[PDB]
Design a protein around this ligand. Structure first.
Ligand SMILES: CO[C@H]1CCN(c2nccc(Nc3cc4c(cn3)nc(C)n4C(C)C)n2)C[C@H]1F
Length: 301
């Protein structure tokens, strides 16, 4: 197929400063930082993913760097560059509000129908872009959707993307390890369920080995209280046994968009419309020298 002419930017260690730790797991650690390129007079807020050195872990991060440097969409996280130190670090855009999963849990009392439905549209747009680029995510979940601003979310975590999270997986994937854009649609349905329930764990208490049998019988995630039959019906269609019967991401963009034009007809939330989240039109929305700071989305070379 088509040659991948994406540019892999090699960044000097001296061009960026680690500020604090954002998260730490088995992979290594993610830091909040600033990237001050060449003689540009710009400070770009960045997230630095730093890898111990084992030949296997270095290949896995370079496989993720390959995919992440090959995407370019407002609703997908792109790789700004890599730094070749003794460790190997991925330079990414800072998503200051973290993962959408923790965001819905921490801010449920100020999350209205407008925000929820717009997030669904944005995720479907990012996913439809990945489809255009012939990329199967294989790990779509609310934990892997990051928040740039409460009004702007992006799909990330390409560590499993190709051309195991059982409770988010399609039945063909659990049983036969078959991954399609239609298996991503199933994971999209589960992600929406996570948003609509304000961060509830799917099939809470049920062990992962029991899921495949539960799905085969016909058991699915329940109707969230805020969901009208209109929204639940969509989630349900993402969980059909026949992958081809499931909606396409382009149809999900359309369906969630029609709904986002009249959000209270499709999601029933007490106190909705009187709820407000931070916006770039708020005071003190934007610690260091705030001079010459530019978001990665506006920094293009
Ligand atoms: C497991 O590795 C993950 C780490 C998170 N990730 C990612 N992609 C693109 C941008 C980005 N930036 C980013 C990540 C942040 C963040 C601010 N900005 N605050 C927190 C708490 N986190 C994560 C650790 C979830 N983070 C995708 C993968 F790199």
């Amino acid at each position: 197929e088509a040659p991948n002419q994406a540019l892999l930017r090699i960044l000097k260690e001296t061009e960026f400063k680690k500020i604090k730790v954002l998260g730490s797991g088995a992979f290594g650690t993610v830091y909040k930082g600033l990237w001050i390129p060449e003689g540009e007079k710009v400070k770009i807020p960045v997230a630095i993913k730093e890898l111990a050195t084992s030949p296997k872990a270095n290949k896995e991060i370079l496989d993720e760097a390959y995919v992440m440097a090959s995407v370019d969409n407002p609703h997908v996280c792109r790789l700004l560059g890599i730094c070749l130190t003794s460790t190997v670090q991925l330079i990414m855009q800072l998503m200051p509000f973290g993962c959408l999963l923790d965001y819905v849990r921490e801010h449920k009392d100020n999350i209205g129908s407008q925000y929820l439905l717009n997030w669904c549209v944005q995720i479907a747009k990012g996913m439809n872009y990945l489809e255009d680029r012939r990329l199967v995510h294989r790990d779509l979940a609310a934990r892997n959707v990051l928040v740039k601003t409460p009004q702007h979310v992006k799909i990330t975590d390409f560590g499993r993307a190709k051309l195991v999270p059982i409770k988010w997986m399609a039945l063909e994937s659990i049983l036969h390890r078959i991954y399609t854009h239609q298996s991503d649609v199933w994971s999209y349905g589960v992600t929406v369920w996570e948003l609509m329930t304000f961060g509830s764990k799917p099939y809470d208490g049920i062990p992962a080995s029991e899921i495949s049998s539960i799905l085969e019988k016909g058991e699915r995630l329940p109707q969230p209280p805020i969901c009208t039959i209109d929204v639940y019906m969509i989630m349900v269609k993402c969980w059909m046994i026949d992958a081809d019967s499931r909606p396409k991401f382009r149809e999900l963009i359309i369906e969630f968009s029609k709904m986002a034009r009249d959000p209270q007809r499709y999601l029933v939330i007490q106190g909705d419309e009187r709820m407000h989240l931070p916006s770039p039109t708020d005071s003190n929305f934007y610690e260091e020298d705030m001079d010459d700071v530019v978001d990665a989305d506006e920094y293009l070379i």
